[PDB]
Amino acid sequence: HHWGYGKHNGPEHWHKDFPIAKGERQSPVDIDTHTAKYDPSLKPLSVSYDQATSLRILNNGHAFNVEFDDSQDKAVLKGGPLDGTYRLIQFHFHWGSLDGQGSEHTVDKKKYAAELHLVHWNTKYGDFGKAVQQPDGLAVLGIFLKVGSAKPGLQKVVDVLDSIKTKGKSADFTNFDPRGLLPESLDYWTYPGSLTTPPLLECVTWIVLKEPISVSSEQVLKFRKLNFNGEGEPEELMVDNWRPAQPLKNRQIKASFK
Ligand SMILES: COc1cccc(N2C(CN3CCOCC3)=Cc3cc(S(N)(=O)=O)sc3S2(=O)=O)c1
Ligand SMILES: [Hg+2]
Ligand SMILES: [Zn+2]
């Protein structure tokens, strides 16, 4: 049937329905810190999430997404390697069944426990749908989650997970402040890539933050209690919803720091 992360419908099978899976700018990729080029022309990232309006959290059977009201420039991303303003539409995570895996991007082959993707679309394209039809339509801010001390800002998300256990469930999730998920530094690596899940569109300018945020094992453990399946179906734990690193091909990863 449809795509997933199972043995039968996982990443290795995606190309059959989405041939772009074998494209030229697929993500995630391995960030080789020594081959990444420091580009002093990269401006600092400008993350303005003060007016962020979260709406709800939903388990879509692939991960849980926290959606935001993107009808106006409420929460945006500018600067960095970006031209124009990008609106935050949603954030979701990719995590593993074990702490040593879960991130999609890896740094020098190192896998983190999870990876937060703050999805933004280029406002010059009017709506999200048109942005996914453009080479610079999306900007995903990726933040690695390292298991260590709890991230207070993530707790609100962790607490609501019980109400969206299965595929299709959703819960109101207003007044959540995404700034609480940002690491201290905004140093980053950037390269042109794609969505890491089908349709695997190559519309993303990836901005992967150098600095991971810490989450407690208890916090990550609650991610793992989610289900890929819908209610009434056999229980399949939502874990390892990550795509392996893809070939960098003809691309250079630029770093905003040296
Ligand atoms: C407009 O809201 C949503 C909700 C959940 C996923 C997605 N989008 C879909 C599924 N989507 C269907 C419509 O055409 C584009 C791809 C997959 C997907 C994967 C993303 S990721 N892992 O590369 O950051 S981001 C993202 S997404 O673009 O936000 C969009
Ligand atoms: Hg595209
Ligand atoms: Zn993602």
User: For atom 25 of ligand 1, which residue has the closest CA?
Assistant: 195
User: For atom 12 of ligand 1, which residue has the closest CA?
Assistant: 199
Please, what is the end-to-end C-alpha distance for the chain in angstroms?
46
Q: How far apart are CA 228 and CA 246, in angstroms?
A: 24
Nearest to 172 by CA among 59, 57, 53: 57
Token readout for 253 is 């990863």
CATH number at residue 14: 3.10.200.10
Which residues does the annotation mark as catalytic? 62
CB-side neighbour CA atoms (13 Å) of 98: 3
Strand bridging mode 106-107 / 30-31: parallel
In which element (H, E) is residue 188 found? strand 188-193
Nearest to 118 by CA among 163, 161, 182, 53: 182
Three-class SS of residue 125?
A: helix
Q: How far apart are CA 29 and CA 167, in angstroms?
A: 28
Three-class SS of residue 247?
A: coil
Q: How far apart are CA 233 and CA 225, in angstroms?
A: 15
- For the Cβ of 65 lying below 6 angstroms from any atom of ligand 1, the answer is yes
One-letter amino acid for residue 181 of the chain: L
One-letter amino acid for residue 112 of the chain: Y
Q: Is 34 annotated as a binding residue?
A: no
What is the position in ligand 1's atom list of the atom closest to the CA of 94?
22
Token readout for 99 is 């702490």
Nearest to 255 by CA among 27, 39, 30: 39
Q: How far apart are CA 236 and CA 218, in angstroms?
A: 20
Q: How far apart are CA 224 and CA 93, in angstroms?
A: 11
| Residues 253, 37 contacting (CB under 8 angstroms) | yes
| Residues 157, 145 contacting (CB under 8 angstroms) | no
Nearest to 23 by CA among 258, 250, 256: 250
| Residues 193, 26 contacting (CB under 8 angstroms) | yes
- For the Cβ of 132 lying below 6 angstroms from any atom of ligand 1, the answer is yes
> CB 211: neighbour CB atoms within 10 A?
14
Q: How far apart are CA 212 and CA 113, in angstroms?
A: 10
Reported resolution, Å:
1.9
Number of domains in the chain: 1
Q: How far is CA 184 from CA 21, 71, 94, 143, 214, in A?
A: 34, 28, 21, 11, 11
Nearest to 233 by CA among 165, 170, 171, 172: 165
Q: How far apart are CA 15 and CA 231, in angstroms?
A: 29
Nearest to 70 by CA among 88, 58, 48: 88
User: H-type helices in 60-208, by residue range?
Assistant: 128-131, 155-160
Tell me which residue range forms the domain holding 163: 1-258
* CA of 141, nearest ligand number: 1
One-letter amino acid for residue 90 of the chain: Q
CB-side neighbour CA atoms (13 Å) of 115: 29
Residue to probe by mutation, ligand 1, list 17, 25, 94, 119, most atoms within 8 Å of CB: 119
What is the position in ligand 1's atom list of the atom closest to the CA of 195?
23
User: For atom 11 of ligand 1, which residue has the closest CA?
Assistant: 199
Token readout for 37 is 């080029």
- For the Cβ of 128 lying below 6 angstroms from any atom of ligand 1, the answer is yes
SS3 content of the chain, % helix, strand, coil (to 5): 15, 30, 55
| Residues 139, 106 contacting (CB under 8 angstroms) | no
